[PDB]
């Protein structure tokens, strides 16, 4: 049963299991992961960078 | 994966989840214009 939940979930059209493996990774816009200069000449970046 | 201080970095999943995540902190709540705060003292002369 627990397996059929997954497989049946993928049975409907427009939805393929192939998406579970990525050949391309998206990149979030830079404003959402910004980089700011600090007092002391150093910089701070989001961990995402 | 840890940055400086052996602090584990915050992934893309960490943005959404947690009390500080997008949903709880930035969506179901926000900071707002036209607001203030201060210490409160008793108002005994005030009407309700």
């Amino acid at each position: 049963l627990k397996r059929l939940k997954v497989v049946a979930a993928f049975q409907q059209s427009g939805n393929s299991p192939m998406g579970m493996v990525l050949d391309a990774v998206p990149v979030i816009p830079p404003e959402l992961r910004p980089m700011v200069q600090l007092d002391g000449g150093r910089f701070a970046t989001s961990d995402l960078n | 994966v840890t940055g400086p201080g052996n602090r584990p970095l915050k992934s893309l999943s960490d943005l959404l989840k947690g009390k500080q995540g997008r949903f709880r902190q930035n969506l179901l709540g926000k900071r707002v214009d036209y607001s203030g705060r201060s210490v409160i003292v008793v108002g005994p002369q005030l009407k309700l």
Binding site: P34, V36, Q37, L38, D39, A44, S46 | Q20, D33
Partner: protein
């Protein structure tokens, strides 16, 4: 997370700071004195001085848009500029 103090501290040295909705709303309001001064100019001087001193067109392109020789553009730029100088002070 980038602290709000870090953002403001960075904006103190920025070319454009952190603008309140108030600033944005006031700047977006029409400047009446400038508008009425521009209205007194002849329409040709108004277009030319507009293009040059606002949009930044060269005399070649301004002449191409206005269908006049470049010399006309020079005369109208100078004369409309002096006109606005006397009008606004």
């Amino acid at each position: 997370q980038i602290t709000d103090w870090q953002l403001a501290s960075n904006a103190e040295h920025s070319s454009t700071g952190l603008r309140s909705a108030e600033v944005e709303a006031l700047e977006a309001l029409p400047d009446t004195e400038i508008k009425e001064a521009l209205q007194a100019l002849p329409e040709e001087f108004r277009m030319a001085v507009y293009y040059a001193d606002v949009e930044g067109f060269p005399y070649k392109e301004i002449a191409e848009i206005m269908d006049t020789p470049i010399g006309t553009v020079m005369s109208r730029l100078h004369r409309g500029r002096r006109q606005l100088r006397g009008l606004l002070a």
